[PDB]
Design an enzyme around this catalytic site. Structure first.
Site, mmCIF file in Angstrom:
data_model
loop_
_atom_site.group_PDB
_atom_site.id
_atom_site.type_symbol
_atom_site.label_atom_id
_atom_site.label_comp_id
_atom_site.label_asym_id
_atom_site.label_seq_id
_atom_site.Cartn_x
_atom_site.Cartn_y
_atom_site.Cartn_z
ATOM 1 N N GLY A 10 0.809 -1.202 0.000
ATOM 2 C CA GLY A 10 0.000 0.000 0.000
ATOM 3 C C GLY A 10 0.848 1.261 0.000
ATOM 4 O O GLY A 10 2.076 1.235 0.093
ATOM 5 N N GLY A 144 -7.188 0.360 1.827
ATOM 6 C CA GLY A 144 -7.823 -0.858 1.348
ATOM 7 C C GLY A 144 -6.817 -1.925 0.972
ATOM 8 O O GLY A 144 -7.055 -3.118 1.178
ATOM 9 N N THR A 179 -8.645 10.917 4.937
ATOM 10 C CA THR A 179 -9.936 11.268 4.363
ATOM 11 C C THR A 179 -10.856 10.057 4.268
ATOM 12 O O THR A 179 -11.856 10.093 3.544
ATOM 13 C CB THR A 179 -9.754 11.906 2.985
ATOM 14 O OG1 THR A 179 -9.129 10.967 2.100
ATOM 15 C CG2 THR A 179 -8.889 13.155 3.086
ATOM 16 N N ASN A 206 -0.561 7.656 13.675
ATOM 17 C CA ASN A 206 -0.279 8.903 12.969
ATOM 18 C C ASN A 206 -0.530 10.117 13.851
ATOM 19 O O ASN A 206 0.165 11.130 13.721
ATOM 20 C CB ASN A 206 -1.116 8.997 11.691
ATOM 21 C CG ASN A 206 -0.419 8.386 10.485
ATOM 22 O OD1 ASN A 206 0.796 8.166 10.492
ATOM 23 N ND2 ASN A 206 -1.189 8.120 9.432
ATOM 24 N N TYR A 224 3.821 13.931 4.423
ATOM 25 C CA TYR A 224 4.201 12.526 4.538
ATOM 26 C C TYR A 224 5.713 12.365 4.610
ATOM 27 O O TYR A 224 6.208 11.407 5.215
ATOM 28 C CB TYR A 224 3.626 11.722 3.370
ATOM 29 C CG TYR A 224 2.154 11.412 3.524
ATOM 30 C CD1 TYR A 224 1.627 11.055 4.759
ATOM 31 C CD2 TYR A 224 1.287 11.490 2.439
ATOM 32 C CE1 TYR A 224 0.282 10.775 4.912
ATOM 33 C CE2 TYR A 224 -0.066 11.211 2.581
ATOM 34 C CZ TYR A 224 -0.560 10.856 3.823
ATOM 35 O OH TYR A 224 -1.900 10.580 3.977
ATOM 36 N N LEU A 252 15.027 -12.271 14.091
ATOM 37 C CA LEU A 252 13.638 -11.891 14.317
ATOM 38 C C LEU A 252 12.975 -12.751 15.386
ATOM 39 O O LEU A 252 12.011 -12.310 16.017
ATOM 40 C CB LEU A 252 12.858 -11.975 13.004
ATOM 41 C CG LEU A 252 13.468 -11.172 11.850
ATOM 42 C CD1 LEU A 252 12.751 -11.474 10.543
ATOM 43 C CD2 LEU A 252 13.445 -9.676 12.160
ATOM 44 N N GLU A 254 14.189 -13.396 18.193
ATOM 45 C CA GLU A 254 14.470 -12.742 19.462
ATOM 46 C C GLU A 254 13.459 -11.652 19.794
ATOM 47 O O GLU A 254 13.385 -11.230 20.953
ATOM 48 C CB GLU A 254 15.888 -12.170 19.430
ATOM 49 C CG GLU A 254 16.514 -11.934 20.796
ATOM 50 C CD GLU A 254 18.034 -11.854 20.735
ATOM 51 O OE1 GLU A 254 18.600 -12.164 19.662
ATOM 52 O OE2 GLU A 254 18.657 -11.486 21.758
HETATM 53 N N1 LIG Z 1 2.575 7.569 8.463
HETATM 54 C C1 LIG Z 1 2.102 7.501 7.221
HETATM 55 N N2 LIG Z 1 0.778 7.180 7.013
HETATM 56 C C2 LIG Z 1 0.285 7.105 5.758
HETATM 57 C C3 LIG Z 1 1.100 7.352 4.662
HETATM 58 N N3 LIG Z 1 0.344 7.209 3.549
HETATM 59 C C4 LIG Z 1 -0.918 6.880 3.917
HETATM 60 N N4 LIG Z 1 -0.968 6.821 5.284
HETATM 61 C C5 LIG Z 1 -2.132 6.485 6.117
HETATM 62 O O1 LIG Z 1 -2.749 5.329 5.589
HETATM 63 C C6 LIG Z 1 -4.155 5.448 5.611
HETATM 64 C C7 LIG Z 1 -4.706 5.180 4.213
HETATM 65 O O2 LIG Z 1 -4.139 3.994 3.706
HETATM 66 P P1 LIG Z 1 -3.285 3.935 2.340
HETATM 67 O O3 LIG Z 1 -1.923 3.312 2.554
HETATM 68 O O4 LIG Z 1 -3.162 5.311 1.721
HETATM 69 O O5 LIG Z 1 -4.227 3.005 1.413
HETATM 70 P P2 LIG Z 1 -3.640 1.852 0.455
HETATM 71 O O6 LIG Z 1 -2.840 0.824 1.215
HETATM 72 O O7 LIG Z 1 -2.808 2.491 -0.633
HETATM 73 O O8 LIG Z 1 -4.943 1.114 -0.146
HETATM 74 P P3 LIG Z 1 -5.913 1.804 -1.238
HETATM 75 O O9 LIG Z 1 -7.229 2.166 -0.579
HETATM 76 O O10 LIG Z 1 -6.155 0.802 -2.343
HETATM 77 O O11 LIG Z 1 -5.234 3.036 -1.791
HETATM 78 C C8 LIG Z 1 -4.488 6.857 6.063
HETATM 79 O O12 LIG Z 1 -4.995 6.800 7.374
HETATM 80 C C9 LIG Z 1 -3.166 7.593 6.054
HETATM 81 O O13 LIG Z 1 -3.063 8.443 7.170
HETATM 82 C C10 LIG Z 1 2.438 7.676 4.863
HETATM 83 O O14 LIG Z 1 3.183 7.897 3.911
HETATM 84 N N5 LIG Z 1 2.932 7.749 6.149
HETATM 85 C C1 LIG Z 2 -14.271 15.380 -3.428
HETATM 86 N N1 LIG Z 2 -13.826 14.539 -2.335
HETATM 87 C C2 LIG Z 2 -12.897 14.923 -1.399
HETATM 88 C C3 LIG Z 2 -12.447 16.245 -1.320
HETATM 89 C C4 LIG Z 2 -11.510 16.613 -0.377
HETATM 90 C C5 LIG Z 2 -10.995 15.679 0.493
HETATM 91 C C6 LIG Z 2 -11.415 14.361 0.432
HETATM 92 C C7 LIG Z 2 -12.360 13.966 -0.505
HETATM 93 S S1 LIG Z 2 -12.860 12.269 -0.539
HETATM 94 C C8 LIG Z 2 -12.444 11.736 -2.157
HETATM 95 O O1 LIG Z 2 -12.062 11.528 0.397
HETATM 96 O O2 LIG Z 2 -14.288 12.219 -0.399
#
Ligand SMILES: Nc1nc2c(ncn2[C@@H]2O[C@H](COP(=O)(O)OP(=O)(O)OP(=O)(O)O)[C@@H](O)[C@H]2O)c(=O)[nH]1
Ligand SMILES: CNc1ccccc1S(C)(=O)=O
Ligand SMILES: Nc1ncnc2c1ncn2[C@@H]1O[C@H](COP(=O)(O)OP(=O)(O)CP(=O)(O)O)[C@@H](O)[C@H]1O
Ligand SMILES: Nc1nc2c(ncn2[C@@H]2O[C@H](COP(=O)(O)OP(=O)(O)O)[C@@H](O)[C@H]2O)c(=O)[nH]1
Ligand SMILES: CNc1ccccc1S(C)(=O)=O
Ligand SMILES: CNc1ccccc1S(C)(=O)=O
Ligand SMILES: [Ca+2]
Ligand SMILES: [Ca+2]
Ligand SMILES: [Ca+2]
Ligand SMILES: [Mg+2]
Ligand SMILES: [Mg+2]
Ligand SMILES: [Mg+2]
Lengths: 438, 425, 349, 54
Positions: A10, A144, A179, A206, A224, A252, A254
């Site tokens: 992810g 996801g 978001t 976070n 980020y 690991l 340990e």
């Molecule tokens: N600490 C940290 N948290 C992150 C970062 N990128 C995303 N997150 C956290 O991860 C959560 C969202 O998960 P993502 O990793 O973006 O989602 P994904 O694994 O790419 O899965 P998708 O929904 O398919 O995009 C949010 O709560 C973000 O705050 C990062 O670079 N650093």
């Molecule tokens: C237009 N949607 C929007 C705008 C600002 C921040 C987040 C979103 S979202 C795609 O997470 O619903």
């Protein structure tokens, strides 16, 4: 020498991987082109850093990492970024459309159609190993992919690498940098299916990383890059024993031994200090006692909670820099007489200390300042269960209305898997309470 | 490469869709001839979401113009950016729809729909990875309403796992072409309840009130009403058209905005809305206060009458993201009785550096609110007022329809109202 | 516009605080489960502290110190006094006490009998628990232990003050209740207004079976005592009267004879647990009102009985005190667009 | 308060201190779960197409 394969899943995992391998290179004197002047064995060798790096005949040192994402935008940065030369194309795996913050989509719908490929790339790295210890898996709870595809990968890894160990670096969901309204669902779904497959999990909240960046680094609105560079510092302090000569946490296995007496309660609480703004005129360097005493301050925990109201099952002190065993114990006694360290009656009230003389390495132009000594405390406290309560409660607010459930059922997941996952967290909360409360 | 296929149907649809491409094409530096002449790489970053790249570095909108009469589409072709559209992507007939849903959905429309889907299929066959579709149209007419909903039904049949998005203009007696608009709108609403994931509800009455009161214009034209729709569309698509911190993506938006399948009708709005005292700088507090005010919303519903299930807000321009977080948290933490407490953190905010042409900063509001039921209640009452006397039904029964079908549409929407009601308590 | 939630419908105190908060027209109340709140007047048992301080943008405050139960539990207080070097087992203002578990279940049974056997060779002890209105006063060790075994909860046996200071006329026992408020900064404020919950029955040291002249609780005196409300209204004497009495009878003031010891006992107790319950470096802040109960013997020495974590207030002092809580505890963290009624007990943090 | 197992090398040292003494599914089963959900999707899509055909 035994190798460690890191898997970044992810966006969160992949980007955090960027920060770690960037730091791993600056620590081991590796250049972006994979060359390592200090390395005297050309194209081979069983040194401590060879647990994270392979070597080609051309003197290149290649990370033992796999980057997986269901959407290619994130991993594409790596392909053209500074360290584009470290990795070969097989190590970077990308799909075309992500899981849309939907656990069911990453585990089932999309996960099924790419699981066998990732394993095929992991098998390649595995075949280069003479004695693989296990895997380090970086991912997020809320994403996801980070949630859905990780748990599927963990199940299969337990099937193909039964005797190998698996540690996690997980990102706890925090509204201040998300978001996604459904992350509580994803976090609880993925903790349910991954629990019996992870030997030791390091949760970073976070919210904690956000505040440390604002309070100590005076970053008004962190990015980020700010978050991940700080996260890779803690990650470096935790993996340093595997990459350097030493006697504490050398493999690991340990990590469970020294931190997890009970399998399900395998979520240590991490604490780190000091974090000093580089933009600061010039800070008064802290001592062993001052940085050790800070390890019992909530403001530097990777998960905001109150250890004063828990019980310790284990404790590791990882030091980097100018630190001798005399000073460590000196500060410990001073803390035992000031703090309330309540262990569990079936665990020794002791702790293990590791000292690496090389002080923490700082990324040029980064946010952190250069310090002479730092420490990271790994303490398995029942207090971290507060984070489970917070999350489980949010899961309950929405599930009482079945809000957003249709998106998961629509991807093939049965509704009962929800309540089955929630019932498991309810068991997890009960375990913590049977071990901590009286 | 997450492409979106755009579709505009009927008079309102094509006139509104026209200005929409007139607006965003300006924001991406694309001129009437499709040539790029901007000055920021951010303009081309996600340019292929809405534009196809032709030979000579030309950018051709991925749009399909549909109508049952040639009048409106001829104008667009002669309009400002008329040259920029793909010559083939014009699919039109000659009989028209006579503001009749039955004609657009069953008789006239059916005779033309297949050739439209042949063009849709053509744009999709070239997409690397198609996110989904967006449709502009009115619900009170015959083509965009009757045939638009027919298109959606057939597009879902051929692309069942793609996201279907629409900008739907709702009819008001105060901005009325014919007395049958309630009949047409009730029939389409049922289709939309079934076959779209998101539907931005634009009420022509709110567009009028904003033009009349907030904007100070004496009973304006459909053109004046459309500049608001243009702005609104450019707003809700900002996070899709530019590199936002978020991944955007239509499906992700749907997952976070739609807690229940049938409750996907959004209330849009934006700020500022200034009359021509226009060069005054607007502070972040002003953007937020107004963005949540009813007078800046296009649905013509009082949010203080319902509750927000989810809220999205896009800020545009170089501003204090710290002060942005401060103000958003101040709106929530000062009116939390209007947000459901069983959806933690149901108010998300993103920033976009590129502002609307000629604006230092702006705000777009996207609200999934149970107050939208007031809109469906209006249409239902207007509908029943005539259907109880079978007034004007012969236009529809003459195209093969039956009263039974009307009675179902009626009940389907009264249930939709009941659904919005149980989630407000 | 500040927002607060109410999660304890049975609180007489904060019912007035919430009433006053609404009066200011600047505090808005929310449903007891709406997480967006600035102030929580939370429940007594199982208050979910772990969910506090995690809503972005909200500085949250709560009316309970997590961990105070150690000081407001009969058995916990004893263990805290015997094990805390700040108080020491030699604490001179707390009666000799012991933790006694019923035999149907560490335990200090043998240690108690050692001290008991020493005295037998005044040896009147009292037993009580936190699951009572159920108390027993006796001088035989066999009757005290058999009484605890007949129950199922943890009890405590402590020395009964056989020489309690008696008020005249009446020759009647009594106790003193002091309200103490500790704010987010951990400043210990003592409410200037105390109360004496006196006994309307003449104290008798030759009969502990009748517990109406020994127990000075407002419920027992108003239920089992037949002279309720004779000398003072509702068996509640206030500092003005009790102060004048000490001057006419004993030729001394309430400040110098009793209050100094009280102020000392409050400090020593609260300062002791400060490291374990302070919220100075925590993500949320805490304050809490306490009800200290003291005893006074014929030698004008003050003794600590117990500390209540959710005490009630004298009917005549609800307005003055509740408003005091809004001033120093709530508005000090959420200001609103004297002659303090408290006594600040300075101390080293 | 004893120090034990003190290891020293060029790059650091480690020790332990005792303040106080004390007092899966098979690849077959995973494929079934995966195919079970895939079938539930095929069924839900079947009902949708059936709906559209009506
Ligand atoms: N600490 C940290 N948290 C992150 C970062 N990128 C995303 N997150 C956290 O991860 C959560 C969202 O998960 P993502 O990793 O973006 O989602 P994904 O694994 O790419 O899965 P998708 O929904 O398919 O995009 C949010 O709560 C973000 O705050 C990062 O670079 N650093
Ligand atoms: C237009 N949607 C929007 C705008 C600002 C921040 C987040 C979103 S979202 C795609 O997470 O619903
Ligand atoms: N060691 C002792 N010596 C003398 N009297 C004692 C005593 N222990 C208890 N008492 C009597 O018992 C009464 C207090 O009882 P206690 O406070 O333990 O019960 P309780 O907690 O249910 C009442 P409260 O509402 O104050 O908490 C006092 O009036 C006092 O006279
Ligand atoms: N906002 C707006 N609404 C319009 C416009 N043109 C028509 N409408 C509304 O749409 C309804 C009539 O639909 P129409 O455009 O004739 O649909 P058609 O049959 O597909 O051409 C009426 O309620 C009109 O008020 C327009 O340009 N802008
Ligand atoms: C755009 N105005 C319009 C359109 C159709 C019918 C009536 C009107 S009005 C509001 O001027 O009475
Ligand atoms: C007045 N606002 C406007 C105008 C034109 C284009 C875009 C916008 S928006 C809603 O994105 O701020
Ligand atoms: Ca080598
Ligand atoms: Ca296993
Ligand atoms: Ca015809
Ligand atoms: Mg992603
Ligand atoms: Mg028309
Ligand atoms: Mg009590």
């Amino acid at each position: 020498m035994r190798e460690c394969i890191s898997i970044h899943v992810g966006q969160a995992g992949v980007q955090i991987g960027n920060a770690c391998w960037e730091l791993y290179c600056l620590e081991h004197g590796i250049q972006p082109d994979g060359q390592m002047p200090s390395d005297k064995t050309i194209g081979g060798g069983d040194d401590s850093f060879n647990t994270f790096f392979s070597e080609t005949g051309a003197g290149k040192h290649v990370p033992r990492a796999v980057f997986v994402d269901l959407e290619p935008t994130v991993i594409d940065e790596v392909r053209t970024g500074t360290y584009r030369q470290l990795f070969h194309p097989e190590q970077l795996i990308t799909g075309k459309e992500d899981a849309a913050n939907n656990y069911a989509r990453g585990h089932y719908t999309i996960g099924k159609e790419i699981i066998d490929l990732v394993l095929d790339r992991i098998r390649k790295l595995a075949d280069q190993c003479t004695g693989l210890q296990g895997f380090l898996v970086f991912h997020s709870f809320g994403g996801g992919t980070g949630s859905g595809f990780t748990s599927l990968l963990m199940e299969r890894l337990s099937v193909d690498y039964g005797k190998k160990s698996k540690l996690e670096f997980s990102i706890y969901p925090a509204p201040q940098v998300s978001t996604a309204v459904v992350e509580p669902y994803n976090s609880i779904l993925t903790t349910h299916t991954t629990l019996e497959h992870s030997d030791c999990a390091f949760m970073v909240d976070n919210e904690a990383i956000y505040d440390i960046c604002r309070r100590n680094l005076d970053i008004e609105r962190p990015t980020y890059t700010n978050l991940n560079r700080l996260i890779s510092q803690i990650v470096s302090s935790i993996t340093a024993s595997l990459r350097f000569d030493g006697a504490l946490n050398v493999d690991l296995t340990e990590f469970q031994t020294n931190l997890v007496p009970y399998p399900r309660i395998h979520f240590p609480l991490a604490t780190y200090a000091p974090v000093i703004s580089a933009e600061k005129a010039y800070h008064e360097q802290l001592s062993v006692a001052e940085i050790t005493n800070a390890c019992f301050e909530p403001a530097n925990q990777m998960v905001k909670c109150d250890p004063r109201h828990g019980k310790y099952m284990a404790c590791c002190l990882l030091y980097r820099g100018d630190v001798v065993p005399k000073d460590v114990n000196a500060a410990i006694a001073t803390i035992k007489t000031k703090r309330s360290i309540q262990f569990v009656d079936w665990c020794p009230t002791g702790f293990k200390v590791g000292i690496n003389y090389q002080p923490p390495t700082v990324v040029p132009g980064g946010d952190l300042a250069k310090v002479q000594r730092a420490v990271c405390m790994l303490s398995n406290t029942t207090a971290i269960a507060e984070a489970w309560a917070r999350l489980d409660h949010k899961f309950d607010l929405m599930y009482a209305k079945r809000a957003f459930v249709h998106w998961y059922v629509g991807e093939g997941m049965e509704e009962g898997e929800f309540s089955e996952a929630r019932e498991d967290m309810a068991a997890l909360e009960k375990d913590y309470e049977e071990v901590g409360v009286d | 490469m997450r492409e979106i296929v755009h579709i505009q149907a009927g008079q309102c649809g094509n006139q509104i869709g026209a200005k929409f491409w007139e607006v965003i094409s300006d924001e991406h530096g694309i001129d009437p001839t499709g040539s790029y002449h901007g000055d920021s790489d951010l303009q081309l970053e996600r340019i292929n979401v809405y534009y196809n790249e032709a030979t000579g570095n030309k950018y051709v909108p991925r749009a399909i113009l549909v109508d049952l009469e040639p009048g409106t589409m001829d104008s667009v072709r002669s309009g400002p950016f008329g040259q920029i559209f793909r010559p083939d992507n014009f699919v039109f007939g000659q009989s028209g729809a006579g503001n009749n849903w039955a004609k657009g959905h069953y008789t006239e429309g059916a005779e033309l729909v297949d050739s439209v889907l042949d063009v849709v299929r053509k744009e999709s066959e070239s997409c690397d990875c198609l996110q989904g579709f967006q449709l502009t149209h009115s619900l009170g007419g015959g083509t965009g309403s009757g045939m638009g909903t027919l298109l959606i039904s057939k597009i879902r049949e051929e692309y069942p796992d793609r996201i279907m998005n629409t900008f739907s203009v709702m009819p008001s007696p105060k901005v009325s072409d014919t007395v049958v608009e309630p009949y047409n709108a009730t029939l389409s609403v049922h289709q939309l309840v079934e076959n779209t994931d998101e539907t931005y509800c634009i009420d022509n009455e709110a567009l009028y009130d904003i033009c009349f009161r907030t904007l100070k214009l004496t009973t304006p034209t459909y053109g004046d009403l459309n500049h608001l729709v243009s702005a609104t569309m450019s707003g809700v698509t900002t996070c899709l058209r530019f590199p936002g911190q978020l991944n955007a993506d239509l499906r992700k938006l749907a997952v976070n905005m739609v807690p229940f399948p049938r409750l996907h009708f959004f209330m849009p709005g934006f700020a500022p809305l200034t009359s021509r005292q226009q060069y005054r700088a607007l502070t972040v507090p002003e953007l937020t206060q107004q963005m949540f005010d009813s007078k800046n919303m296009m649905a013509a519903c009082d949010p203080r009458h319902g509750r927000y299930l989810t809220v999205a807000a896009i800020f545009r321009g170089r501003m204090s993201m710290k002060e942005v977080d401060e103000q958003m948290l101040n709106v929530q933490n000062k009116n939390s009785s209007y947000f459901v407490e069983w959806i933690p953190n149901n108010v998300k905010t993103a920033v976009c550096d590129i502002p609307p042409r000629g604006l230092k900063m702006s705000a777009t509001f996207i609200g999934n609110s149970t107050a939208i039921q007031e809109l469906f209640k209006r249409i239902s009452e207007q509908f029943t007022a005539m259907f109880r006397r079978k007034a004007f039904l012969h236009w529809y029964t003459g195209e093969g329809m039956d009263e039974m079908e009307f009675t179902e549409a009626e009940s389907n929407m009264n249930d939709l109202v009941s659904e919005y009601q149980q989630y407000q308590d | 516009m500040y927002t607060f939630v109410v999660r304890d419908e049975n609180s007489s105190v904060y019912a007035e605080v919430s009433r006053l908060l609404l009066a200011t027209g600047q505090w808005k109340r929310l449903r007891k489960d709406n997480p967006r709140f600035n102030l929580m007047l939370g429940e007594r048992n199982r208050l979910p502290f772990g969910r506090l301080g995690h809503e972005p943008g909200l500085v949250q405050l709560v009316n309970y110190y997590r961990g105070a139960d150690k000081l407001c539990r009969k058995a916990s207080l004893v263990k805290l006094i015997k094990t805390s070097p700040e108080l020491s087992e030699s604490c001179t203002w707390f009666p000799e006490s012991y933790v006694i578990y019923p035999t149907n279940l560490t335990d200090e049974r043998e240690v108690f009998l050692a001290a008991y056997n020493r005295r037998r060779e005044g040896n009147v002890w009292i037993a009580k628990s936190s699951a009572g209105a159920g108390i027993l006063i006796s001088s035989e060790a066999s009757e005290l232990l058999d009484f605890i075994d007949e129950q199922g909860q943890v009890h405590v046996i402590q020395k009964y003050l056989e020489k309690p200071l008696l008020l005249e006329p009446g020759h009647r026992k009594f106790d003193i209740r002091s309200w103490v408020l500790v704010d987010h900064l951990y400043n210990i404020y003592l409410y200037r207004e105390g109360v004496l919950r006196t006994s309307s029955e003449p104290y008798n040291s030759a009969n502990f079976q009748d517990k109406t002249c020994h127990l000075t609780n407002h419920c027992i005196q108003k239920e089992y005592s037949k002279n309720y409300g004779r000398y003072e209204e509702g068996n509640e004497m206030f500092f003005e009267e009790f102060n004048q009495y000490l001057m006419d009878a004993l030729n001394t003031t309430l400040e110098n004879s009793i209050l100094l010891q009280i102020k000392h006992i409050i400090r020593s107790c609260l300062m002791c647990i400060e490291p374990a319950i302070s919220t100075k470096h925590l993500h949320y802040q805490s304050f809490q009102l306490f009800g200290f109960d003291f005893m006074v013997d014929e030698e004008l020495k003050v003794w600590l009985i117990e500390v209540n974590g959710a005490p009630a207030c004298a009917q005549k002092l609800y307005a003055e005190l509740c408003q005091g809580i809004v001033d120093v505890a709530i508005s000090s963290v959420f200001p609103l667009a004297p002659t303090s009624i408290f006594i600040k007990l300075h101390h080293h943090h | 308060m004893e120090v034990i197992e003190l290891n020293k090398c060029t790059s650091g040292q480690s020790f332990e201190v005792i303040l106080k003494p004390p007092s899966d599914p098979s690849l077959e089963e995973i494929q079934k779960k995966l195919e079970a959900a895939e079938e539930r999707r095929k069924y839900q899509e079947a009902e949708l197409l059936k709906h559209l055909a009506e």
